Write a protein that binds this ligand. Sequence first.
Ligand SMILES: O=C(O)c1cccnc1
Length: 319
Amino acid sequence: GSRARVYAEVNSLRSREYWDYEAHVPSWGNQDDYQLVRKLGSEVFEAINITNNERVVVKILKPVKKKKIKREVKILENLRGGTNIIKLIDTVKDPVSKTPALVFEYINNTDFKQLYQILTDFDIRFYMYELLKALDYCHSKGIMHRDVKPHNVMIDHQQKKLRLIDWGLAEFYHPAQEYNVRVASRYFKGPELLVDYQMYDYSLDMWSLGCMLASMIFRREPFFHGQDNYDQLVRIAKVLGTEELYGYLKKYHIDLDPHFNDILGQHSRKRWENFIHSENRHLVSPEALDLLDKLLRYDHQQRLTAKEAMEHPYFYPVV
Ligand SMILES: O=C(O)c1cccnc1
């Protein structure tokens, strides 16, 4: 099949305890230590630690999902202290219902729908670079996020702080492992997911990041706007090209779902310059498009790693 180009073996250098999350036994404190005051900005609340009066964020989990709770807790613990990764403060249970919850550092977020409209060229370079630091970090620890999207990138624009959140879909990368392709959120799903290729890796997060970069510099949010998972691939092919899609599938011996036969159509590859017009011209540059082209490409294995992306000339002003 395929393997990752950069942190392929990191989990083989770990003790089984590190990645065997089904065996992890969280220590559950008492949620009564927390006063849940308001909804944050889903089942996430602003809270006050009653002991020290510190503001935190409490995320209530779904009690019946044992595997995923252990997986999210283990991954968050493995990543603790990672650059721009949301800090898990505590793991607690409500003493009556026994429902598990996670306690996180508080970040005063600006909704991306408003924030992205005032970002400058420099701002986009700055925050993308910060997000790349988080991805390079978690990839280096053998973990794929699998849900990179604007809602999961909290930004405090006052303090210039960025935190990558919601590790509920994150998984450990093991070479040749076959994963669930029904992950991420529709607009940010990589083509490997949409064609049911299960042997994917960290490069999935780099596709999602590319989708974010495209929506920020082009002001088309989301950039690939599929109406369903099938149409999502069609939207991508209208840009990257249909013959190019087939080349990708041939290289990895992927059979295309026959449903695509009559909806895919025929589309030549578009040059990224095609998406420039007066409303986004001040966010676009040749270096932006060169980076983008090396992220949003079918071949997951040839996509830039997070570290390679960080070395790109697009980030020279923020390095
Ligand atoms: O990890 C999460 O889901 C999270 C963390 C802080 C704030 N909102 C969500």
